[PDB]
Amino acid sequence: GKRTFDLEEKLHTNKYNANFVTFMEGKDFNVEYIQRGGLRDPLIFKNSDGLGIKMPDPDFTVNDVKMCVGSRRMVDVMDVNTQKGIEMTMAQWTRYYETPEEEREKLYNVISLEFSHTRLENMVQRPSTVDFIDWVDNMWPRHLKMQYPKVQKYCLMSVRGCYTDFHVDFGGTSVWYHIHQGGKVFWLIPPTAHNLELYENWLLSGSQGDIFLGDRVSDCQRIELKQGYTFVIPSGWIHAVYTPTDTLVFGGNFLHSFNIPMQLKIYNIEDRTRVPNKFRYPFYYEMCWYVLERYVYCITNRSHLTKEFQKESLSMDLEQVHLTHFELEGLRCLVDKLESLPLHKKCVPTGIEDEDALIADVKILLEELANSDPKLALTGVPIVQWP
Ligand SMILES: [Fe+2]
């Protein structure tokens, strides 16, 4: 939007004083933290230290991006004055970023450039903790990485003045954010049963653009991200973003096993809200089956993939257990969800032999481990390791 309500007011009134964001040191961001909290709090690290992140040399610019992914390359740009207008490439767009503000004709924003394809990849690496819990590196069969939700690394490039209205990222994913150059202002809203309600009825009634959802909730936090900060958003959070100055950001969306109920909670919103099967998370329910099969294999040492995939996994490798309540309830959710899908679209992936045997093997594993000691679960390392 930015239509009816004064965004300018929303930016300076000092009233979105909620205290949701937790400030901490990257060293403190280990897997145990996740098992202890379930990545339920948005995090803001000021020093990239301790996070195991790697980013280009600070002077890196927009074209240094468009050189790498090269010009003539089509990019999904959109005029933040309505929607969609992806009629341009890196060539045509770096020629816009450097266009002095006043001359600047339209208002553009590029929030969806996922470069993992391009060389830039081994030039930009996310915090190692995220490499431990990510459902792609650790869940999806390795030899397949389209056929692997290529939605890990992203390059955000915004121009002073753009505003992305309130939304919850796709597939109930979490997201890490590193402002390389510039700054961003966020409006954080918690995925309270109540807020998620208001949020859906808002997506239905039209997202009016006349209502600033931030004012609709009892408490909301407007935070400011500076150059150097790393920002972690947990699944489900409803946020809105505004760019005070031309910025360059590097981040990515991931799924993990400690907040499954919320992730699914969001898919169903995306379902009821008839979201276009375009912006849907790639192979969602298919990733789910691999999740179960990894859990049942890492714990029961009973493989449920096919012989073929089993060989592939073994070849590549050669080149009791106490769960948190988070995973236990989460597994319970994947099981009920998958079981409630009409037979035709249960989206059983390709590497899985018998599905029902799996589900049965999980209902059994979910009852045997029903009593896990929260203390003992805190192993410091995810049980699903070695994709
Ligand atoms: Fe977002």
UniProtKB/Swiss-Prot annotation:
Q: Which UniProt keywords apply?
A: ADP-ribosylation, Biological rhythms, Chromatin regulator, Chromosome, Dioxygenase, DNA-binding, Iron, Isopeptide bond, Leucine-rich repeat, Metal-binding, Nucleus, Oxidoreductase, Phosphoprotein, Repeat, Repressor, Transcription, Transcription regulation, Ubl conjugation, Ubl conjugation pathway, Zinc, Zinc-finger
Query: Could you tell me at which residue positions the Glycyl lysine isopeptide (Lys-Gly) (interchain with G-Cter in SUMO2) crosslink is annotated in this chain?
Result: 375
Annotated GO biological processes are:
chromatin remodeling; circadian regulation of gene expression; double-strand break repair via nonhomologous end joining; negative regulation of transcription by competitive promoter binding; regulation of circadian rhythm; regulation of transcription by RNA polymerase II
Enumerate the residues binding Fe cation: 167, 169, 239
State where substrate binds: 164, 184
What cellular component terms from Gene Ontology apply here? chromosome; nucleoplasm
Q: What happens on changing residue 167 to A?
A: Abolishes histone demethylase activity. No loss of its ability to repress the transcriptional activator activity of the CLOCK-BMAL1 heterodimer
Annotated membrane-spanning segments are none
Instruction: Give one GO molecular function term.
Output: histone H3K36 demethylase activity
Primary location class? nucleus
Location within or outside the cell: Nucleus, Nucleoplasm; Chromosome
Query: Does Ubl conjugation show up as a keyword for this record?
Result: yes
Q: Name the tissues where it is expressed.
A: Widely expressed, with highest levels in brain, testis and ovary, followed by lung.
Which intervals hold domain JmjC? 115-271
Fill in the subunit field for this protein.
Interacts with CBX5/HP1A; the interaction promotes CBX5 localization to chromatin. The SKP1-KDM2A complex interacts with UBB. Part of a SCF (SKP1-cullin-F-box) protein ligase complex.
Q: What does this protein do?
A: Histone demethylase that specifically demethylates 'Lys-36' of histone H3, thereby playing a central role in histone code. Preferentially demethylates dimethylated H3 'Lys-36' residue while it has weak or no activity for mono- and tri-methylated H3 'Lys-36'. May also recognize and bind to some phosphorylated proteins and promote their ubiquitination and degradation. Required to maintain the heterochromatic state. Associates with centromeres and represses transcription of small non-coding RNAs that are encoded by the clusters of satellite repeats at the centromere.
For domains, the record's comment is: The JmjC domain mediates demethylation activity and is required for satellite silencing.
What does the sequence similarity comment in the record state about its family? Answer: Belongs to the JHDM1 histone demethylase family.
Its protein name is Lysine-specific demethylase 2A
Which part of the complete protein is shown? 34 to 517 of 1162
